[PDB]
């Protein structure tokens, strides 16, 4: 008996998606994260998702999600430094795996940032929080997006200037920003607009300035392909997996 019973142990973190608590099983001592609260969409989308690099959904207001004891990728990033290139590559590999999966089933997260990339006990990356996620492909038919979603430093430039835009390049772009944050310990701009000096400098290719200065030429080459303003000219994920740094053996 008693297997259905969980003890709430500590609050893990907040949100206007709701407060999150740590549940531990009375009997099995298994640990899950319980969300405390649109909300029907998050639950619907969670039910589609099964992948090593996506936070696991257990059931259900109470949402039952995989507990990631490693915390946030955000906390493995030393300010102004970043992290060791090999760790960044590994994390990036796992992020790509997760995003390839999501896009595979026609779902875009829309808010990819280190705070939403959690780590398990073995430091495997898991994409978290699908409260802003939406379907972009259904019955093999793509639907453009038009609603502003996400976080300014991470959003693609077309999202600020276009009425409609493809969902996938947006996720690729924010992944690029994450890669940057991982290798330099800083975000390049407040937002990708032409009134942002930093973004202007990047478009003019002044990579002798931070954060690009702190980034090796190989990863920077990849970033040169990801952070392209025109979403049509931007590298897709299949080609990211052919990039030289992506395939560079690192220790
Ligand atoms: C070790 C502590 O880390 C956490 O706080 C944490 C652990 N496991 C989690 N699984 N799912 C979440 C999570 C977080 C935020 C939103 C949603 C949704 N929907 C799920 C989670 C953890 N978060 C708890 C709240 O604060 C952090 C936000 N990423 C981490």
Curated annotation (Swiss-Prot):
Signal peptide: none annotated. The active site is at residue 111. Expressed ubiquitously with the most abundant expression in thymus, testis, small intestine and colon. Changing residue 111 to A: Abolishes kinase activity. The autoinhibitory region (AIR) inhibits the activity of the kinase domain. Changing residue 113 to R: Strong reduction of chromatin-associated CHK1 ubiquitination. GO terms for biological process: apoptotic process; apoptotic process involved in development; cellular response to mechanical stimulus; chromatin remodeling; DNA damage checkpoint signaling; DNA damage response; DNA repair; DNA replication. Phosphorylated by ATR in a RAD17-dependent manner in response to ultraviolet irradiation and inhibition of DNA replication. Phosphorylated by ATM in response to ionizing irradiation. The keyword Mitochondrion does not apply. The chain holds residues 4 to 270 of 476 of the full protein. There is a cross-link at residue 113 (Glycyl lysine isopeptide (Lys-Gly) (interchain with G-Cter in ubiquitin)). Belongs to the protein kinase superfamily. CAMK Ser/Thr protein kinase family. NIM1 subfamily. This is Serine/threonine-protein kinase Chk1. It comes from Homo sapiens (Human).
């Amino acid at each position: 008996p008693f297997v259905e019973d969980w003890d709430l142990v500590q609050t893990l973190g907040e949100g206007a998606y709701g407060e999150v608590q740590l549940a531990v099983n009375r009997v099995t001592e298994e640990a899950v994260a319980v969300k405390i609260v649109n909300i029907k969409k998050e639950i619907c989308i969670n039910k589609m998702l099964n992948h090593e690099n996506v936070v696991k959904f257990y059931g259900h207001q109470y949402l039952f999600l995989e507990y990631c004891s490693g915390g946030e990728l955000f906390d493995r990033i030393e300010p102004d430094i970043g992290m060791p290139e090999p760790d960044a590559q590994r994390f990036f590999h796992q992020l790509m795996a997760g995003v390839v999966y999501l896009h595979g089933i026609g779902i875009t997260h829309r808010d990819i940032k280190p705070e939403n990339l959690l780590l398990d006990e073995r430091d495997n990356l898991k994409i978290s929080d699908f409260g802003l996620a939406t379907v972009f492909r259904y019955n093999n038919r793509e639907r453009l997006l038009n609603k502003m979603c996400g976080t300014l430093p991470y959003v693609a430039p077309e999202l600020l200037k276009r009425r409609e835009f493809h969902a996938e390049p947006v996720d690729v772009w924010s992944c690029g920003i994450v890669l940057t944050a991982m290798l330099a310990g800083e975000l390049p701009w407040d937002q990708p607009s032409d009134s942002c000096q930093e973004y202007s400098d990047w478009k003019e290719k002044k990579t002798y300035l931070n954060p690009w200065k702190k980034i090796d030429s190989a990863p920077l080459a990849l970033l040169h392909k990801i952070l392209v303003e025109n979403p049509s000219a931007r590298i897709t994920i299949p080609d990211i997996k052919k990039d030289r740094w992506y395939n560079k053996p690192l220790k």
